[PDB]
Amino acid sequence: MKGILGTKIGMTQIWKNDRAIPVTVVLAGPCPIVQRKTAQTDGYEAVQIGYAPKAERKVNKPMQGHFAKAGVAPTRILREFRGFAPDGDSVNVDIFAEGEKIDATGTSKGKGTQGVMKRWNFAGGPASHGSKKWHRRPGSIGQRKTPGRVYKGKRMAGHMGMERVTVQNLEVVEIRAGENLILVKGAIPGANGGLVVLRSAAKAS
Amino acid sequence: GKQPIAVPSGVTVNAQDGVFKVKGPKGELTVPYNTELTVRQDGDQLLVERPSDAQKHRALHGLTRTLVANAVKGVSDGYTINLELRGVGFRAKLTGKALEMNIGYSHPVIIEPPAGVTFAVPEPTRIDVSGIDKQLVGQVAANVRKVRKPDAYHGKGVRFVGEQIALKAGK
Amino acid sequence: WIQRINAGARLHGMNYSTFINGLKRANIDLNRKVLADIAAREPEAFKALVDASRNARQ
């Protein structure tokens, strides 16, 4: 249910009581409501809010129409959340309480194309026992004539990164509302200045 | 094989369709019988004959009859089962309707009664499961018992008031 | 040809095989090429052959 948008600002050291907590600083700036999707409107229950501000001079006629219909003023980013309401618009105030466990989604830093070691954790090869250009390669890719083919899904070199990743049960250390900042324990995927969606827990714990 | 059906005056077995219902002085009851078996009242009493005299017909026969019979004693005298708790300080009580089993499991077992059924606890070590239908009371007191089957070494558990649990004797 | 014939046969409530013994019985001696073309092209006529054949069957 609960959810909001913001940007990953960075990681830092703070102390609650006497242990050094590592904290990721998130800015969940205010989100306007824009679209409210219901059953008889769209089939399914959801709300579409928006995050980063955007000047008119950069906004499509159709997009302007969109935003204008709910009179909101325009945003570089829209996203949906299944099963959500209140009224007005949405700041991380109230929406999160300190101590509450949340789920943080982002887009992992992308690594480009990566061999089987870096990508999958292959074992590599003998750096020295006569190994002949087989230091980093993935060994064998199959059996023999049964089944004369290569398994579908077989892990091998490829585009590692730039993927959507959700970390579960991160703990809301601090909330400075009206700076729209959530101090969150641990680590969120994706680089500084990246987009993150924060959510209630998926799990009860 | 079996036939006679002593149906006292407080009954009303509207044998209409295959839905040979009965309504009674403890509460109305409904019961499905085979259509192709044919059952009705032909006097003071009631009766369930049958078409073919093969095997299968002789099977849904006695079944069907004993079932109407159960429905009969059901809305009539009403049904009731008796249970004994036994073993080093076991005990039960009542939560509105819920049964409060304290059978030596670190954390106790409450039991909610399905509708038509009522729990009873006289002395705290004896339980009564009573009500309209016989099948269900069977099907529930079943649960109450299985909460702890009488073990084979010391008869500890839930049993039927006069059950002769055999004791195996250990060492 | 056979396919089409069976079809027409069954439009008027007759199986093909029974339709063809029907025809042989009444000693109508038609090609099934021709029987097909009757069946497909000329409704009433095929109908008539049907009635003749179920008569031959009676």
Binding site: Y151 | - | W1, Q3, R4, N6, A7, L11
Partner: protein
């Protein structure tokens, strides 16, 4: 010299599967679709009738056929064999039971796949096709 016609018609008809044994209904439907029952019948063209199915969810199945009849899909990856029982298929997505049988009973080349189209299953009592005013066809041996 033998007659080749012209696909003029687009003939639409509604079948109610309520209480009908699956295979048999599958035969009536499959056949109406393939074209046979049509005196002109021409194989290399598709001349079949459009078939709406209703009340798929109430299709009959000769016991103990639910709990025992198994459908099998395969995904390409190892351990891909996914199976589901008639009862399961029938609760999750009944239309796919009917589709699956009928599709078994059509040919399997270009033309047949093309024939799948002219099937339109719906579970329960209604359909959205009243604009094609389809004509009703009774389940019968005939």
């Amino acid at each position: 010299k033998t007659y080749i016609p012209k696909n003029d018609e687009q003939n639409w008809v509604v079948v109610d599967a309520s209480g009908v044994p699956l295979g048999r209904l599958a035969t009536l439907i499959a056949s109406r679709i393939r074209g046979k029952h049509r005196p002109d019948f021409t194989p290399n063209m598709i001349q079949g009738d459009f078939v709406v199915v209703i009340n798929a969810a109430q299709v009959a199945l000769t016991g103990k056929k639910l709990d025992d009849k198994v459908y099998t899909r395969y995904t390409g990856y190892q351990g891909g064999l996914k199976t589901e029982t008639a009862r399961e298929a029938l609760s999750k997505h009944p239309e796919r039971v009917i589709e699956h049988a009928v599709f078994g009973m059509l040919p399997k080349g270009r033309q047949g796949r093309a024939m799948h189209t002219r099937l339109k299953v719906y579970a329960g009592e209604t359909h959205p096709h009243s604009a094609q005013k389809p004509q009703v066809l009774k389940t019968q041996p005939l």
